[PDB]
Design a binder for these strands. Structure first.
Length: 156
RNA sequence: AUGGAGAGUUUGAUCCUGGCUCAGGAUGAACGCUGGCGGCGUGCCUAAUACAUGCAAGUCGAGCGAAC
């Protein structure tokens, strides 16, 4: 019903009074299995109760990503923090591979025609923030038609 | 619109302007070389570098005086 992508569970070796406190920050993408990105981080002792903790406290950070005719409406970027991304269009009837950054952004948008792009670095805390920067800065067909305030077939 | 766009760099993590140390192809090329065979092309790119040369291109009377 909901494509939840739990990337990893960052641990911490707290060097406080206690011998060695264990704090697992379960990282899970809050995707709605449609086209939204979704990102939430927990801090509970139980990963299962921590993964849903960030899914019930952070589920409004997603963005609606529409599709034209099976191809990305506009090749957007991502200038938020170090890690960056890029939207590359492909044919509707295609697929994705492995080797690079995060995979829970274009995989949520069941279309198999978008290539997930994010160089920046490996840090998965400032690389997903740039993906939502471009997703919210995406240009739609009518979205840009209102900008001019004329016809949809008069701005292409 | 066949539709660019990595980082670091600054506290103990940082955002943010800014500049390049640095994820590539190109390299009229040479290069230390392990450079099987070759179609095709460029070749004193360093050099209007100095000067022994082989060396510019020979002929003709329908119009005139060889021995022929």
């Amino acid at each position: 019903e909901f494509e939840e992508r739990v990337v990893t569970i960052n641990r911490v070796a707290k060097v406080v009074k206690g011998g060695r406190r264990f704090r697992f920050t379960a990282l899970v993408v809050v995707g709605d299995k449609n086209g939204r990105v979704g990102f939430g981080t927990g801090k509970a002792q139980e990963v299962p109760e921590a993964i849903k903790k960030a899914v019930e406290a952070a589920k409004k950070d997603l963005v609606v990503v529409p599709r034209v005719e099976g191809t990305t409406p506009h090749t957007i970027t991502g200038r938020y923090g170090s890690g960056s991304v890029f939207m590359k269009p492909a044919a509707p009837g295609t697929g994705v591979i492995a080797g690079g950054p995060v995979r829970a952004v274009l995989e949520l948008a069941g279309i198999t025609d978008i290539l997930s792009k994010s160089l920046g670095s490996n840090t998965p805390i400032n690389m997903v923030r740039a993906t939502i920067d471009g997703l919210q800065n995406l240009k739609n067909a009518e979205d840009v038609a209102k900008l001019r305030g004329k016809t949809v077939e008069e701005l292409y």
